[PDB]
Design a protein around this motif. Structure first.
Motif, PDB file in Angstrom:
ATOM      1  N   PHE A 227     -36.040   1.019  45.622  1.00 47.38           N
ATOM      2  CA  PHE A 227     -34.816   0.981  46.409  1.00 47.38           C
ATOM      3  C   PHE A 227     -33.690   0.331  45.612  1.00 47.38           C
ATOM      4  CE2 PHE A 227     -38.241   1.222  49.576  1.00 47.38           C
ATOM      5  CZ  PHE A 227     -37.824   2.321  50.298  1.00 47.38           C
ATOM      6  N   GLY A 228     -33.888  -0.934  45.217  1.00 50.31           N
ATOM      7  CA  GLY A 228     -32.838  -1.743  44.616  1.00 50.31           C
ATOM      8  C   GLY A 228     -32.628  -1.428  43.136  1.00 50.31           C
ATOM      9  N   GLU A 229     -31.899  -2.322  42.454  1.00 54.53           N
ATOM     10  CA  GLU A 229     -31.640  -2.242  41.022  1.00 54.53           C
ATOM     11  C   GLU A 229     -32.651  -3.090  40.254  1.00 54.53           C
ATOM     12  OE1 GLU A 229     -27.499  -3.263  40.230  1.00 54.53           O
ATOM     13  OE2 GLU A 229     -26.782  -1.731  41.643  1.00 54.53           O
ATOM     14  N   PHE A 230     -32.839  -4.341  40.703  1.00 56.54           N
ATOM     15  CA  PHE A 230     -33.731  -5.302  40.072  1.00 56.54           C
ATOM     16  C   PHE A 230     -34.833  -5.686  41.050  1.00 56.54           C
ATOM     17  CE2 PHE A 230     -29.237  -5.972  38.907  1.00 56.54           C
ATOM     18  CZ  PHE A 230     -29.270  -5.594  37.579  1.00 56.54           C
ATOM     19  N   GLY A 231     -35.850  -6.390  40.541  1.00 55.72           N
ATOM     20  CA  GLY A 231     -36.959  -6.830  41.370  1.00 55.72           C
ATOM     21  C   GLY A 231     -37.860  -7.835  40.660  1.00 55.72           C
ATOM     22  N   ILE A 232     -38.833  -8.355  41.419  1.00 55.81           N
ATOM     23  CA  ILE A 232     -39.763  -9.382  40.970  1.00 55.81           C
ATOM     24  C   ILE A 232     -41.180  -8.830  41.151  1.00 55.81           C
ATOM     25  CG2 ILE A 232     -39.569 -10.598  43.229  1.00 55.81           C
ATOM     26  CD1 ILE A 232     -40.080 -13.214  41.631  1.00 55.81           C
ATOM     27  N   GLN A 233     -41.943  -8.769  40.052  1.00 53.78           N
ATOM     28  CA  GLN A 233     -43.245  -8.121  40.009  1.00 53.78           C
ATOM     29  C   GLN A 233     -44.345  -9.174  39.899  1.00 53.78           C
ATOM     30  OE1 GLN A 233     -44.477  -5.771  36.468  1.00 53.78           O
ATOM     31  NE2 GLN A 233     -44.690  -4.039  37.880  1.00 53.78           N
ATOM     32  N   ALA A 234     -45.431  -9.009  40.670  1.00 53.71           N
ATOM     33  CA  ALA A 234     -46.574  -9.911  40.615  1.00 53.71           C
ATOM     34  C   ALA A 234     -47.371  -9.675  39.331  1.00 53.71           C
ATOM     35  CB  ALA A 234     -47.445  -9.714  41.834  1.00 53.71           C
ATOM     36  N   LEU A 235     -47.767 -10.768  38.661  1.00 53.02           N
ATOM     37  CA  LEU A 235     -48.667 -10.731  37.515  1.00 53.02           C
ATOM     38  C   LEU A 235     -50.096 -11.128  37.893  1.00 53.02           C
ATOM     39  CD1 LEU A 235     -46.263 -12.420  34.941  1.00 53.02           C
ATOM     40  CD2 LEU A 235     -46.676  -9.977  35.209  1.00 53.02           C
ATOM     41  N   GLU A 236     -50.308 -11.636  39.120  1.00 45.92           N
ATOM     42  CA  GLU A 236     -51.588 -12.171  39.566  1.00 45.92           C
ATOM     43  C   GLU A 236     -51.830 -11.758  41.015  1.00 45.92           C
ATOM     44  OE1 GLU A 236     -51.473 -16.320  36.901  1.00 45.92           O
ATOM     45  OE2 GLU A 236     -51.084 -16.458  39.067  1.00 45.92           O
ATOM     46  N   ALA A 237     -53.109 -11.621  41.393  1.00 45.46           N
ATOM     47  CA  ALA A 237     -53.485 -11.301  42.761  1.00 45.46           C
ATOM     48  C   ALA A 237     -53.399 -12.557  43.625  1.00 45.46           C
ATOM     49  CB  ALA A 237     -54.879 -10.724  42.811  1.00 45.46           C
ATOM     50  N   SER A 238     -52.871 -12.417  44.849  1.00 47.67           N
ATOM     51  CA  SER A 238     -52.873 -13.497  45.823  1.00 47.67           C
ATOM     52  C   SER A 238     -52.561 -12.975  47.220  1.00 47.67           C
ATOM     53  CB  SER A 238     -51.881 -14.582  45.461  1.00 47.67           C
ATOM     54  OG  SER A 238     -51.838 -15.621  46.431  1.00 47.67           O
TER      55      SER A 238
END
Ligand SMILES: O=C(N[C@H](CO)[C@H](O)c1ccc([N+](=O)[O-])cc1)C(Cl)Cl
Ligand SMILES: [K+]
Ligand SMILES: [K+]
Ligand SMILES: [K+]
Ligand SMILES: [K+]
Ligand SMILES: [K+]
Ligand SMILES: [K+]
Ligand SMILES: [K+]
Ligand SMILES: [K+]
Ligand SMILES: [K+]
Ligand SMILES: [K+]
Ligand SMILES: [K+]
Ligand SMILES: [Mg+2]
Ligand SMILES: [Mg+2]
Ligand SMILES: [Mg+2]
Ligand SMILES: [Mg+2]
Ligand SMILES: [Mg+2]
Ligand SMILES: [Mg+2]
Ligand SMILES: [Mg+2]
Ligand SMILES: [Mg+2]
Ligand SMILES: [Mg+2]
Ligand SMILES: [Mg+2]
Ligand SMILES: [Mg+2]
Ligand SMILES: [Mg+2]
Ligand SMILES: [Mg+2]
Ligand SMILES: [Mg+2]
Ligand SMILES: [Mg+2]
Ligand SMILES: [Mg+2]
Ligand SMILES: [Mg+2]
Ligand SMILES: [Mg+2]
Ligand SMILES: [Mg+2]
Ligand SMILES: [Mg+2]
Ligand SMILES: [Mg+2]
Ligand SMILES: [Mg+2]
Ligand SMILES: [Mg+2]
Ligand SMILES: [Mg+2]
Ligand SMILES: [Mg+2]
Ligand SMILES: [Mg+2]
Ligand SMILES: [Mg+2]
Ligand SMILES: [Mg+2]
Ligand SMILES: [Mg+2]
Ligand SMILES: [Mg+2]
Ligand SMILES: [Mg+2]
Ligand SMILES: [Mg+2]
Ligand SMILES: [Mg+2]
Ligand SMILES: [Mg+2]
Ligand SMILES: [Mg+2]
Ligand SMILES: [Mg+2]
Ligand SMILES: [Mg+2]
Ligand SMILES: [Mg+2]
Ligand SMILES: [Mg+2]
Ligand SMILES: [Mg+2]
Ligand SMILES: [Mg+2]
Lengths: 58, 135, 80
Positions: B29-40
């Motif tokens: 959807f957006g331009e930028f974002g934050i991606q998970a590197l670990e499961a939680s």
RNA sequence: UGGUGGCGAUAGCGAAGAGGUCACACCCGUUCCCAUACCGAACACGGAAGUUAAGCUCUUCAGCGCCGAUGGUAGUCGGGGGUUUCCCCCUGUGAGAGUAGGACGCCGCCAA
RNA sequence: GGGGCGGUCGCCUCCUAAAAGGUAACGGAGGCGCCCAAAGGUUCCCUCAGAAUGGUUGGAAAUCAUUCGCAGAGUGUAAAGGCACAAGGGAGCUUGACUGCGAGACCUACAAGUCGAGCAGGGACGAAAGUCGGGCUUAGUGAUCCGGUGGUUCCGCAUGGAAGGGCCAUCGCUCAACGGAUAAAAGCUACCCCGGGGAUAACAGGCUUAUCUCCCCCAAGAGUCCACAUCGACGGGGAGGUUUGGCACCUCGAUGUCGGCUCAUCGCAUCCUGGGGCUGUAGUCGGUCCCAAGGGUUGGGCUGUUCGCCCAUUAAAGCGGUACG
RNA sequence: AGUCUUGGAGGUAGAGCACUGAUUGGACUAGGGGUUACCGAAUUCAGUCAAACUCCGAAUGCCAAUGACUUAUCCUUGGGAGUCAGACUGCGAGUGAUAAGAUCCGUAGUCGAAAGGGAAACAGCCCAGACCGCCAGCUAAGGUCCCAAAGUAUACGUUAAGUGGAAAAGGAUGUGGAGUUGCUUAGACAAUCGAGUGACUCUGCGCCGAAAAUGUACCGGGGCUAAACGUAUCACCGAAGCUGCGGACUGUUCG
RNA sequence: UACAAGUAGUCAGAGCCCGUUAACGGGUGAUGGCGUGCCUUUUGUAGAAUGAACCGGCGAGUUACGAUCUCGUGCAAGGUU
């Protein structure tokens, strides 16, 4: 052709199905060697216990 | 605070978190974002804290998509009880996040503002993350 | 102090599913498949019992077969 | 062409045309056999005034539906390793999705 | 996950259950102890939910009509698996919701439970083929003993009868603690006793660390201005093993349990004293953090107390460990 | 019985959204509210998720068949038992807090009932199954500076933390290897001058974060800058494994 | 045998002292390696679980009558009192 199968590793600590395959090849003792005809049956047994046996073409 | 309007079953198994994320691995959807590197597990409390953090930094100046939804209930037994005598009561709500999952997306701001907004959000979360862009 | 669970019940497992293999010889009356409803249909020389049990009508070889697009059937064919 | 089978919608749906003399229909009668929770609608029994409009038959189409690889990836049997809610490596196996592509019917028997 | 108290006890369906089957927990969800004389059998015929469009009452929703419409309905009832050549809906005629059985299977410790083509008798529906030994399927049940009722080419204690028994059919159980100890049964024991158990609780140890104590990360804010002198919301990460717990691994052929007294000893997360940085440090005082464990760290009132409050001191009246030494 | 070959049942892993639930944003609005996007259900486009969702769907495991190759089990009847406290480890689940050396199942192993070598010591981990003798030999795991048997081995790198030889978020001009990119002898960058410099991404090994109670006490010890780590190679040591030689007994087949 | 850390042995082993059922002998044992009694009960015990001060004696699946199976013997469609 004839394969020359040697039991390199012990059957102790190994799943029953692997121990039976080793025993069905006629290997009752570590470092024992058996001679079998090279075919898909014997090759398939070797495949299942390849980590236990050493093979060499006779 | 995000939670389902209703659920089929109030008490679910905890499940397992093997593998990378099934979907939502790219900024859609957006331009930028934050991606998970670990499961939680990400609780709804963590999502809200993360949401307010990034939203406040942007000064009403850009849109936020929360890409994870805390659908899964988790239970807890009352304090100081023995084992058994049935499963615990529902306590809260979690989103299951696996590596690769984009958690939040931002648009309508610069990369500089987006990076800082998403940095502030990352500190509210229990996982390592990386800033990502739409390809 | 502790509450209690309202669950804790289950019925006896009913041992459903296949009772003879594809390619296996069966005598007449041999149950081939136990089921609720018709997961598998009666094919040739196979009857469906009152509880949907599939059974051989003849002596012969069991054959689980595709029945059209979605469905399955089991048949017994005479040995010859 | 009509009847009647077999084959997973590769057979379908939809769209656009074409064709009837015989055959198949629609169609036109309700006196009788028979009929409808009411009706000759349908089911019946009778007819051939005219129509290919529809069904049916034959062509064209990939819009939808269906079929569908190869490669890659997920997973994983077996064997190892690590920082062990998990992860990695090796011989093997191998999807789903996506896609190339296929496909607007294929094989009988009988009658005319 | 000690016992008590609470809950549960048999049967059916699903999930857990790791793609045969099976599979546990005081694991997660629900049902059953029936109902139906058609809601059964058979023959023939049929197609549902909902929506769109139009309609006097009439409205979103009754009743038409049209088109669309794999089922988005229905299937007596829980759920699952099935079901539209219907197992769903309708109508006609019926009683197979039959008697004798039963090759062979499934399930299974046993007892039971399940399916079954087919044969005979005599039927129902159908022109016939054929289908029918209840219901789309899987719960709706209870051993034996004993007793009742009906039937009976059986037995009948010298003989004939009879009494009574047998056999076949069937009835009498919330025997629900549902494989049912008796036809018939509640409590107290701190007056207690024996056999056992660390198979199992109360103490301490151990594991764990939710809780607890301490330390952090981010920095929205507070602080006149100023996030970071000081404090630090929403959230995030640890350490410790002093708390309350969890678990039940040592000890029940005994590991004495609170507080005090006597004697200490160790850790440092430092109460005082020593040395420092920053300060929203003028000075005198303080705040906060860093180094530092050498030594020191009070007498009373109340309470069994620990603790706490209070009185009066002190440079200070530290916090913890040592089987709560 | 094993393996190959062939066929089959079944819905897990994964995946997917066709159904049932949950669910994000946009488009467009029934309709209900302040004629209006004022807010809007459905619809539509894209997007997430599921033990009790499935249009799909493995690996394995399971049931068979036919031969082949291999192996020697299997069944029936009868006599005699013992067992019905299990444990840990790996993997798949539940319960728990995705705590427990917890608990409860599934699956494989070991212990139990298993001595030997390794893991300092250490039922359950790694290697391996002790008939008995030998002052023979080869190996396994694990090792080769000294305790302590064998390399102070070889080659090329890395680490400066005693990291190795406990511990996270987060913090940082530590240092090695890649790559991208701005500016620069038309003079950068630092403070006119004279060659570079300053951002970012991935990655190897380190650093801080790091405080417990009798005594160093979180390599077994000494001690180690390799005697650590990575990659590769070859020697050797190393067990009650295997071999050799001798002996005893049991079984099978023909002493 | 008075610098030693000990389930008390075991294997290796000098030195010293002996001399036999004559054997690749006996006693002793500096020193080196290895090594947590026995029993019971346990998932697991060196166990900081149980039992035994030591030594000696005594101290626990028997017999009868039935049943059943195996083996043996006699006779055998019979066998036996
Ligand atoms: O019972 C005793 N002691 C047991 C060990 O046998 C144990 O030490 C114990 C002590 C106190 C306790 N408590 O206070 O509950 C429990 C157990 C005896 Cl000393 Cl009386
Ligand atoms: K407990
Ligand atoms: K009827
Ligand atoms: K009972
Ligand atoms: K104590
Ligand atoms: K800290
Ligand atoms: K005790
Ligand atoms: K001090
Ligand atoms: K296990
Ligand atoms: K070190
Ligand atoms: K010795
Ligand atoms: K004791
Ligand atoms: Mg079930
Ligand atoms: Mg029935
Ligand atoms: Mg009670
Ligand atoms: Mg399985
Ligand atoms: Mg199964
Ligand atoms: Mg009785
Ligand atoms: Mg008489
Ligand atoms: Mg009972
Ligand atoms: Mg009883
Ligand atoms: Mg009294
Ligand atoms: Mg009294
Ligand atoms: Mg007593
Ligand atoms: Mg115990
Ligand atoms: Mg305790
Ligand atoms: Mg103790
Ligand atoms: Mg806070
Ligand atoms: Mg405690
Ligand atoms: Mg236990
Ligand atoms: Mg004692
Ligand atoms: Mg300090
Ligand atoms: Mg004490
Ligand atoms: Mg999955
Ligand atoms: Mg067990
Ligand atoms: Mg355990
Ligand atoms: Mg299994
Ligand atoms: Mg035992
Ligand atoms: Mg064994
Ligand atoms: Mg060992
Ligand atoms: Mg050792
Ligand atoms: Mg032992
Ligand atoms: Mg060697
Ligand atoms: Mg040496
Ligand atoms: Mg270290
Ligand atoms: Mg040996
Ligand atoms: Mg001396
Ligand atoms: Mg000395
Ligand atoms: Mg015990
Ligand atoms: Mg002692
Ligand atoms: Mg005892
Ligand atoms: Mg004693
Ligand atoms: Mg004695």
């Amino acid at each position: 052709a004839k394969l020359e199968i040697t039991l390199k590793r012990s059957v102790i600590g190994r799943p029953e199905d692997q121990r039976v395959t080793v025993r069905t090849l006629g290997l009752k003792k570590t470092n024992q060697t058996v001679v079998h005809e090279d075919n898909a049956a014997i090759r398939g047994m070797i495949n299942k216990v390849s980590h236990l046996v050493s093979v060499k073409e006779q | 605070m995000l939670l389902p309007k209703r659920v089929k079953y109030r008490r679910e198994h905890r499940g397992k978190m093997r593998g990378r994320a099934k979907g939502g691995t790219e900024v859609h959807f957006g331009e930028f974002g934050i991606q998970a590197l670990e499961a939680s597990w990400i609780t709804n409390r963590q999502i809200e804290a993360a949401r307010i953090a990034m939203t406040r930094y942007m000064k009403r100046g850009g849109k936020v998509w929360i890409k994870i939804f805390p659908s899964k209930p988790y239970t807890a037994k009352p304090l100081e009880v023995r084992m058994g005598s049935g499963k615990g009561a529902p306590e809260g709500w979690v989103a299951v996040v696996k590596p690769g999952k984009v958690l939040f997306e931002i648009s309508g701001v610069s990369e500089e503002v987006a990076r800082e907004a998403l940095r502030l959000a990352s500190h509210k979360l229990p996982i390592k993350t990386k800033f990502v862009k739409r390809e | 102090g502790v509450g209690s669970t309202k669950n804790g019940r289950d019925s006896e497992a009913k041992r459903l599913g296949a009772k003879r293999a594809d390619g296996q010889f069966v005598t007449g009356g041999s149950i081939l498949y136990r089921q609720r409803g018709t997961k598998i249909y009666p094919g040739e020389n196979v009857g469906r019992g009152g509880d949907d049990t599939l059974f051989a009508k003849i002596d012969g070889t069991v054959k689980f077969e595709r029945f059209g697009r979605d469905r399955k059937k089991v048949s017994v064919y005479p040995v010859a």
